[PDB]
A paper describes a structure:
Transglutaminase 2 (TG2) is a calcium-dependent enzyme that regulates many biological processes, including apoptosis, autophagy, inflammation, and extracellular matrix formation. TG2 is regulated by the binding of guanine nucleotides and Ca2+. The transamidation activity of TG2 is inhibited by GTP or GDP binding, which stabilizes its closed structure, thereby obstructing the accessibility of substrates to the active sites. In contrast, Ca2+ acts as a cofactor in the transamidation activity by inducing conformational change to the active open form.
To identify the Ca2+ binding sites, a Ca2+-containing crystal of TG2 was produced in totally different crystallization conditions from those used for the previous structural study of TG2. A relatively low-resolution structure of 3.56 Å was solved and refined to Rwork = 22.5% and Rfree = 26.3%. The structure revealed that the asymmetric unit (ASU) cell contained three molecules. The final structural models were constructed with residues 2-687 for chain A, residues 3-687 for chain B, and residues 9-687 for chain C. GDP was detected at the nucleotide binding site in each chain. After careful analysis by comparing the current structure with previous TG2 structures that do not contain Ca2+, we identified two tentative Ca2+ binding sites in the structure of TG2. The first binding site is located in the catalytic domain and is coordinated by the side chains of E437, Y159, and E155. The second binding site is located in the β-barrel 1 domain and is coordinated by the main chains of N497 and F537, and side chains of E539 and N498. Binding of Ca2+ to E437 and E539 induced some structural changes in two loops of TG2, amino acids 406–412 and 460–470. Thus, binding of Ca2+ to E437 and E539 is likely to promote an open active conformation of TG2 by altering the hinge structure. Intriguingly, the present Ca2+ bound TG2 crystal structure is a GDP-bound compact form that binds Ca2+ at only two sites, namely, E437 and E539.
Author numbering:
A (entry chain A), B (entry chain A): 2 to 83, 86 to 464, 466 to 468, 471 to 687
The structure:
């Protein structure tokens, strides 16, 4: 009469991980997404259920201080048909009972402890079934992070390899990145990352209860990448002397960054920069289920303190004399996260710009975001989370002053530089770049742009010698060779002029730091004939820039054309990206799941001098569980090619993007990638 | 005593089709590759083998007139260990006997009839086990068509969707093509194609015996595409009036072409052009196992009768007055097949240029090929199969004569046109274009090129006013809008000139046919100031070219600059490709094998006028067994976008390239493609 119910072999079906799009994550722990029912199988050694005999209720607690009011702890009874924490009986057969548990769409994210309390009237018992991790659901309708396009959900959540776009605005290069959010151990690393955040240390219960909202999780996640004081994922150095750590450009996948962080206590890992911060932030948010895409903005006005107007003071040569002034970044990277905003006036649901790179502010040094991109486009700077900084970054106006020899400065015309240019992020389902510049700004000169700027109360700036000049490069220039770049002057006036044109080309880092000039040509008496174009060539030599070039291979050409009669100053500036040698990747053998695959990577040295200490680094999520590195024994000469073969074992079927990086003493951070389609065994 | 051996349920294992890389082809018929052993399972209803009791020999015949000397018929006995037609016993279990049959590497290709003659001493019997198709093996070492790189074998044989590169040399567009060699029924269509060829009609036995060599099969296959008289796959019209048939540019996959051919008796299908001939030839050869890649050559000297020197006579405006003269083709397509050549001096193994497009010759009208590309590069025109024609196509010299008003003609300088330019074919394993121009020609001005030209006994042609002119387009121009193209003159001489510059832009077809001019600007007194560049603009209007534009969207700009003092003629010509509107393709639902998948295709109309009778055609090998076509009910207006949804059921897992074509009255043959990765069920 009324025998105690005893259970054994509780199994949390890994088939529901395919249902929850957490298939890769379901390795020795059950990971599911909120707002969606997940299968649960219970095995007993007696009566299968005996509902008319036994009543049992589930209790789940996630935080260290679980609270029912806070939403971190909830207990629910079992019923045969449907607060939104619901456990229901799908079926009973043999000695096995099959249940379907449902989590609320606003449930907090984190590790959960599942306990069952089965009291059959008299007596009864309580014990823990297991542990599971609840992530944001991009497929669950009414979840804050919901995407209506399945391809969009797949690319912005499930896809582990993508492109980080960098280089120059005129010539954009897609550097491959392996986000690898589902690489082994990363989810626990992200949970540790959240569990050591300042809000949690201050009040763990408040934080764990507040982790339901994607906006809070995004703020914390981006903050944990090299933003706040004490613990962080990365440490930032911009001075181009990364001797004691991994170079910022050397990175090819964020997986090793997180692994380095957790393995060495929780010390900031090596050296990181704006793209690295955005890439690891996107890895964390994608792992946690928040749809996130890394975005690059070219000619970005970073470090200005939310400033719409930047004034540059230049000398007679056009070089900027400011010692306090911060230069326009060649490009800046930040992330965008797809979520709904219930703390703002309705209609701001969508892409939110989270900038994990710390920005200078009067309040202090701290990363901006998340601000709806809609606010930036409409100029609604009153929106809560760091709207003016991002808007100023995209829509800053730059004014170039040239110092006259007599007293005051004179205004020059620079039409070659436009801020917030060629905003780009990887397209959904393709390798092509998607230009999202329209998402942040309206078309220039439109009524809609005018009203949006008026909303920011920023209506300033559009001209007053019928001449123009721009920098032209002709055909492409590869890194490691001397090449010519031309300064093209277009005179469409009856007047014929004698002028002074000053050309200076300087090795420049991606964040605007200018090194010493690698090319200089000054003409004090240049004759511009009427209604004609004149092109003055500047020869840039490999030897002149080799020592002081960045790892971003950026070189800035500046030209200043002065008409003396009317004393008119015309300025043209353009950033060249010296192209690295291509990496030729050959896949050897038939590519199949859990089958040895050989990848042969080779590059042909493009320098006059020999390359020494060459090292190939290869990383892929689904292609190799661990990063593969090969060191080349002997130096590689001027003509010679470096070719090596690395064995990989891919355990995931499907498309994966293998990223390769070659590093040498004279050539650094040359990237390559190859799409690999793994078949079934 | 000595019971008769009776067999039943003979099964030709479809698992060996995965072994033979014929997995897609193994549908209700066994297709295997020569030079490799294929599994065979025999079921009996008595003694499993009783070798000490029964001796049985296999006999296979392929042709209609099988001959042992010819190699079309061969009979071989069964032994337990290894003429190269070998049947051996791998294993015996229960009532089942498992054999492994081996075909010779030089075995002829075609349909084979497998017969077994089992005589157990006294009596015995004979009967047919089944039918199988033997194809070229690119994986079998020592087979003539052998590739050492697995990726190369996969792309040049197994890959069913690729790119046909066309457009202009300066701006190359990759048109997607669905070769679909493994699409249902195509292999039988190709065998019918071979079985109706002239050599077979003349002497079937000789042809079937000669089908062992890939060179013979290639000659016949390329011939059957619109080359020889009577039966052919395609019929060619170049006059741009394809009313009664499918347009040459409308095609997106060669599968429908072959199906149209066989379904309607064997009548030439619709209208075809050089790329169509090459595409169907590549489909046939890839289906038959010969590694083949379609190759495009820009500024190709086709229809010249193997001529290394082409003379053009032009008027005062630079327009070509020749009424007999054939113009330089903007681009020409042909195929390349990988095979060894035993009919030539050793060392010509490799890519063979087969040009299925019929070329004018003194002997008659007939397609060239297969000539080793090595011969073209080395200038060894004595090589057997149409070497001088292809070499002349790539390395022809063009001389432009401008007729003087007084008597004779005067020689002009055209540095804007170089023949055999930007030779390109789809890369192996990627969508990127691979430039194979180096494969046909050595670097200009090198000693190796000089000796190669000397081998062709073609050493002619490199100049004698320090001026130059080229056509510049600035930013891209989309089709359906007016745009400006500039004629850029560079004077680097102390002399200042007054000159006459004549600009004429004419709608041009891809094979050089020039329609009426859509832009004209003539300046009789243009002033070029010293040491300066002058750009003269020509406005090309949509209304001016809409009626007479080709389906290739090609427009040829011609500029003639005449200096009168020294009477120097400078010529610049360039072909623009008006870019079509992009097709935005959205994949809806999770993509899985044998699961309904929705593809939404949409394009935004780029014309001033409305589009009527819009029709979307969608084709994919592995995505749809049959071509899917949707007709848009109402006209699409100037602003509006055309968007439609087509259900597809993909039955093959893996990567497939879905090709889409949109056709309307005002916009024609706009292409798009999307890579689709089909997961398992
Ligand atoms: N500006 C720039 N152009 C590059 C770079 N690398 C290659 N290119 C080539 O430069 C060409 C584009 O130059 P463009 O913007 O048209 O200059 P312009 O036409 O002379 O005014 C392309 O053919 C590119 O392949 C680079 O780092 N910067
Ligand atoms: N020549 C040509 N250029 C095109 C076409 N369509 C787009 N373009 C654009 O033209 C630019 C390249 O022109 P380029 O060869 O550098 O001319 P140039 O620098 O003015 O002498 C690229 O930015 C292309 O995007 C076309 O059909 N023909
Ligand atoms: Ca988007
Ligand atoms: Ca001008
Ligand atoms: Ca090749
Ligand atoms: Ca000049």
């Amino acid at each position: 009469a009324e025998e105690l119910v005893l259970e054994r072999c509780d199994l949390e079906l890994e088939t529901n991980g395919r249902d929850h799009h957490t298939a890769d994550l379901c390795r020795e722990k059950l990971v599911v997404r909120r707002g969606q029912p997940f299968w649960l199988t219970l095995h007993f050694e007696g009566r299968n259920y005996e509902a008319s005999v036994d009543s049992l209720t589930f209790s789940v607690v996630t935080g260290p201080a679980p609270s029912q009011e806070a939403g971190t702890k909830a207990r629910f009874p079992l019923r045969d048909a449907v607060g939104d924490w619901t456990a229901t009986v799908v079926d009973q057969q043999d000695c096995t009972l099959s249940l379907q548990l449902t989590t609320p769409a606003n449930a907090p994210i984190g590790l959960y402890r599942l306990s069952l309390e089965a009291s059959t009237g008299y007596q009864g018992s309580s014990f823990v079934l297991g542990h599971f991790i609840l992530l944001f659901n991009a497929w669950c309708p009414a979840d804050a992070v919901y995407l209506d396009s399945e391809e969009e959900r797949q690319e912005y959540v499930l896809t582990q390899q993508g492109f980080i776009y960098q280089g120059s605005a005129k010539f954009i290069k897609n550097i491959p990145w392996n986000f690898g959010q589902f690489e082994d151990g990363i989810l626990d690393i992200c949970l540790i990352l959240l569990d050591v955040n300042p809000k949690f240390l201050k009040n763990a219960g408040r934080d764990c209860s507040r982790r339901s909202s994607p906006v809070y999780v995004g703020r914390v996640v981006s903050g944990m990448v090299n933003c706040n004081d004490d613990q962080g994922v990365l440490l930032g150095r911009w001075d181009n002397n990364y001797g004691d750590g991994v170079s910022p450009m050397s990175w090819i996948g964020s997986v090793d960054i997180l692994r380095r962080w957790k393995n060495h206590g929780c010390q900031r890992v090596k050296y990181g920069q704006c793209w690295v911060f955005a890439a690891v932030a996107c890895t964390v948010l994608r792992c946690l289920g928040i749809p996130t895409r890394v975005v690059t903005n070219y000619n970005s006005a970073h470090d200005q303190n939310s400033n719409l107007l930047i004034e540059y003071f230049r000398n007679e040569f056009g070089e900027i004399q400011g010692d306090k002034s911060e230069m326009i970044w060649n490009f800046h990277c930040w992330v965008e996260s797809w979520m709904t905003r219930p703390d703002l006036q309705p209609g701001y649901e969508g892409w939110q710009a989270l900038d994990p790179t710390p920005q200078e502010k009067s309040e202090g040094t701290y990363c901006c975001g998340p601000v709806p991109v809609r606010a930036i486009k409409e100029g609604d700077l009153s929106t809560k989370y760091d709207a003016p900084f991002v808007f100023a970054e995209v829509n800053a106006d730059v004014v170039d002053w040239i110092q006259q020899d007599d007293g005051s400065v004179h205004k020059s015309i620079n039409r070659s530089l436009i801020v917030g240019l060629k905003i780009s992020t990887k397209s959904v389902g393709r390798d092509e770049r998607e230009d999202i510049t329209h998402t942040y700004k309206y078309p220039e000169g439109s009524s809609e742009e005018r009203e949006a700027f008026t909303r920011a109360n920023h209506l300033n700036k559009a001209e007053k010698t019928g001449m123009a000049m721009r920098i032209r490069v002709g055909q492409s220039m590869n890194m490691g060779s001397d090449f010519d770049v031309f300064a093209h002057i277009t005179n469409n006036t009856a007047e014929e002029y004698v002028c002074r044109l000053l050309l200076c080309a300087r090795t420049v880092s991606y964040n605007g730091i200018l090194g010493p000039e690698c090319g200089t040509k000054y003409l004090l008496n240049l004759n511009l004939e009427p209604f004609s174009e004149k092109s003055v060539p500047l020869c840039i030599l490999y030897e002149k820039y080799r020592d002081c070039l960045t790892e971003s291979n950026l070189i800035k050409v500046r030209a200043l054309l002065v008409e003396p009669v009317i004393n008119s100053y015309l300025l043209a500036e353009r950033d060249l990206y010296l192209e690295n040698p291509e990496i030729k990747i050959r896949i050897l053998g038939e590519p199949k799941q859990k089958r040895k695959l050989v990848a042969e990577v080779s590059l042909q040295n493009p320098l006059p001098v020999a390359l020494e200490g060459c090292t190939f680094t290869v990383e892929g999520a689904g292609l190799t569980e661990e990063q593969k590195t090969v060191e080349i024994p002997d130096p590689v000469e001027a003509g010679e090619e470096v070719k090596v073969r690395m064995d990989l074992l891919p355990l995931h079927m499907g498309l994966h993007k293998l990223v390769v990086n070659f590093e040498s003493d004279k050539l650094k951070a040359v990237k390559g990638f190859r799409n690999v389609i793994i078949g079934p065994a």
